[PDB]
């Protein structure tokens, strides 16, 4: 019952003819799956460890110049020569300074001058790369029925942790009283590692784009260096001064840590103090409900009295969780829980904690249910001692549908075509929508890559105006539709 | 001459004593006594709260975090009064005499 | 404008419009930096911690 507290919780209801459902386990989001006659399960992606990343490129963010030297030639005598020019760790530049009799030359003109200073690196930002091979996810599956505590079992916990690495596609988790859940996850397509750099500057690490990382204008080493002195592109971290065309000087151009922090705007930070832990990105899995059994089936109904040990609480997703304790005979029995209307003539509310049961006499099992909008009754127990607890659900139905549509749009924005594999059970509409989304998303990524959200909004407004003014209505509708989607993406981007 | 500093800018800061205070949902924003200390930088946000977190209500709980801001390096912007400029000029007669 | 070991002659409005923490210049103690938020970042991912 982890998902209760999480604001980003999605309810996936239904399984295919084969009793499988595919889901996307995003980081920081909890998924709860409800299937008829099936235990309700809570899936959370809690970790993404990338192991043994190989260094790709070292960048210099803070250098220091030393051993500065200068050589001059009299005018018309070519360029001077510095022995330090042969060495590649000296940054050198050629310029011309006015010469004459006063400065020791027999000709009045511009003589060549060369300034060389030894370039040294104080701080560098390694950028490492991982191959999907050593990309190990971690998922927690918690049987959503029971009581939500991690101290019930000394050896472990009620929830199970399964590590989804690319080596094994099938990961099978055995729940103590619920059978086994099978996840056929696909780690290779979750996040496009090997098109992505694990940038690590000092004690902070990010997850940057490989092309962006390789386009950074800083001194860099290949990444396989051992001496670590032959920096490439040194002149990006050095200034040469020839102020009055009289002498030339070279300065080190300060430290680039803060500028790099500003540059990393828009990159999701990660952890590298131990193991290169990533807490971002999604994962696509298929659920195997076939071997999942309800924990408390083949119990007799509880006929005793029930008391509410915890006041009914309205969870953020429109459900209610109530903790009740059983005081009656027949310890291991199944709780009679119902949600009806004010006349007690209909069962209006659905039960998220399907098949609530009393495992132990003195154990406060907690129940999550979805009541209907408006006034209702939460009834627990049989008629002698049955609890009627009135509830009012604050919202409306149409508002909930609007919210669900907006949530689906936000999923289509955060995720790519995977938004079509979040709730799908196969089917031609899902497949066709996914294919069309793939085509339009390829076109949109080609068109809008590397553009800020402000530019996306500007382009959306421009396209909307063009469509609004188009004389052909087919083109007009298409253009306004594209512009509206572009505006929405601009508003929702910068997540 | 006689430049007077008008402003010091911090170019390399440091955060040392981080403290945080959390409030349960529908109870408003929390309070830190460091929040009205001027040498502390603070920010208010909302974190998910619930039974696991220890609240008893399900919603967004106000959160505040504060760290002490310390400057390790600064850049002094100085100003000079126009009366304090002293230009130096050299007048050499183009005579042809040697040193 | 004197930074660490180097100095520049800069416009005064440009200098007063820089996005960095600043003391008024008469503060010997340096315990009241202004605009401290331009040199720190507050991160709240997943709405779980800050």
């Amino acid at each position: 019952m982890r998902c209760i507290g999480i604001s980003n919780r999605d309810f996936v209801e239904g399984v295919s003819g084969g009793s499988w459902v595919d889901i996307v386990l995003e980081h920081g989001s909890c998924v709860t799956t409800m299937a008829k006659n099936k235990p309700t399960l809570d899936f959370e992606l809690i970790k993404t460890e990338a192991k043994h990343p190989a260094t790709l490129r070292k960048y210099c963010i803070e250098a220091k110049l030393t051993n500065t030297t200068t050589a001059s030639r009299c005018p018309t005598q070519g360029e001077p020569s510095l022995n330090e020019e042969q060495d590649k760790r000296f940054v050198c530049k050629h310029s011309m300074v006015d010469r004459g009799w006063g400065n020791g030359c027999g000709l009045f003109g511009k003589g060549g001058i060369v300034t060389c200073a030894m370039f040294t690196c104080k701080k560098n930002m390694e950028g490492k790369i991982v191959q999907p091979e050593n990309l190990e996810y971690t998922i927690v599956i918690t049987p959503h029925s029971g009581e939500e505590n991690a101290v019930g079992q000394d050896t472990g916990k009620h929830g199970k942790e399964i590590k989804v690495t690319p080596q094994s596609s099938i990961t099978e988790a055995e729940l103590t009283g619920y059978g086994t859940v099978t996840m056929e996850c696909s780690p290779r397509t979750g996040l496009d590692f090997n098109e992505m750099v694990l940038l690590q500057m000092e004690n902070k690490a990010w997850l940057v784009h490989r092309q962006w990382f390789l386009d950074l204008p800083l001194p860099w080493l290949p990444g396989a260096d051992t001496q670590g002195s032959n920096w490439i592109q040194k002149e990006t971290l050095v200034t040469f001064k020839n102020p009055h065309a009289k002498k030339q000087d070279v300065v080190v151009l300060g430290s680039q840590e803060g500028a790099m922090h500003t540059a990393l705007t828009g990159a999701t930070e990660i952890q590298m103090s131990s193991g290169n832990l990533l807490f971002t990105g999604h994962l696509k899995c298929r659920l195997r409900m076939d071997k999942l059994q309800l924990k408390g089936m083949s119990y007799s109904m509880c006929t005793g009295k029930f008391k509410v040990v915890k006041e009914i609480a309205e969870t953020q997703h429109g459900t209610i969780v109530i903790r009740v304790q059983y005081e009656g005979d027949g310890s291991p029995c199944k709780i009679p829980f119902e949600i009806m209307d004010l006349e007690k003539r209909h069962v209006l509310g659905r039960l998220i904690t399907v098949n609530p049961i009393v495992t132990e006499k003195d154990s406060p099992v907690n129940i999550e249910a979805e009541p209907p909008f408006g006034d209702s009754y939460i009834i627990i127990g049989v008629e002698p001692g049955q609890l009627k607890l009135s509830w009012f659900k604050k919202g409306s139905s149409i508002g909930q549908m609007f919210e669900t549509t907006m949530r689906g749009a936000k999923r289509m924005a955060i995720l790519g075509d995977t938004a079509w594999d979040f709730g799908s059970l196969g089917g031609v509409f899902t497949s066709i929508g996914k294919a069309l989304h793939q085509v339009f998303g390829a076109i949109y990524g080609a068109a809008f890559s590397g553009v800020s959200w402000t530019m996306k909004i500007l382009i959306g407004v421009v396209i909307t105006w063009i469509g609004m003014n188009s004389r052909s209505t087919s083109l007009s509708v298409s253009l306004v539709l594209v512009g509206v989607v572009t505006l929405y993406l601009g508003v929702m981007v910068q997540a | 001459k006689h430049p007077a500093t008008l402003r010091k800018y911090c170019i390399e800061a440091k955060l040392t004593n981080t403290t945080t205070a959390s409030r349960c949902p529908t109870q408003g924003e929390p309070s830190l006594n460091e929040e009205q200390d001027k040498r502390f930088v603070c920010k208010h946000s909302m974190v998910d709260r619930g039974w696991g977190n220890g609240c008893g209500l399900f919603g967004k709980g106000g959160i505040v975090t504060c760290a002490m801001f310390t400057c390790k390096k600064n850049m002094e912007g100085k100003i000079v009064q126009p009366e304090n400029l002293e230009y130096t000029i050299v007048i050499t007669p183009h005579s042809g005499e040697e040193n | 404008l004197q930074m660490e070991n180097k100095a520049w002659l800069v416009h005064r409005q440009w200098f007063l419009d820089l996005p960095l923490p600043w003391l008024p210049g008469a503060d010997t103690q340096g315990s009241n930096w202004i605009q401290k938020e331009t040199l720190v970042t507050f991160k709240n991912p997943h709405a779980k911690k800050q």
Partner: antibody
Amino acid sequence: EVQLVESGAEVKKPGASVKVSCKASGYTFTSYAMHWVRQAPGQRLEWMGWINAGNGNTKYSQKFQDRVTITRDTSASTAYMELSSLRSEDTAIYYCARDKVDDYGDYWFPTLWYFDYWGQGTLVTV
Amino acid sequence: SQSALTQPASVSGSPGQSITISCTGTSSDVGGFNYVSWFQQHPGKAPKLMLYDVTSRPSGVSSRFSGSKSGNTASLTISGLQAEDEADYYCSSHTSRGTWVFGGGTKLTVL
């Protein structure tokens, strides 16, 4: 289940440096965060602070935030609490407890059973 | 910080009866957060967690121990006092500032 064994009682002169280890077995050390509780003989339990074994993050009490330092070994499977400036008030038995951190290694909010397991106790008479 | 947790210094009850221990604290820790935990400490023994939540208790602990919290006060209720209930009981809470406050402690003595 899980077991935590603290060190033997130490009698020290006031002002000396104290260091008492609490090796905890039966569970992933870096998974849980280990707290330190002090109780003067004949007085209440008194919370010093916690050290997270996952990443070394620590928190000390207002009272102890100057002379009290907590460090742990991930490999040695032990966490150490050291008191800097000893005093007669500091003559108490110091108890090490444990609380599990979240799935992300952070220790923002504790588990409701935040002191489910303790140590037998180490007595220091300053 | 400070022992905001204030509970009766001395408590006694006849064997077999029901005795309650009340722990009071500020609205920061015990009035706002359900982290009220009750710990029993025997002579020369380390504290043992009795109720980790306001009312929840560990597997080992018997069901005679039941807690409650109303307003800023937390109450430990023991039903059917035995001769093995003569230990001290320390309430604790997770303060809103992230610290831990223990109660003064109640020494239970049975007649």
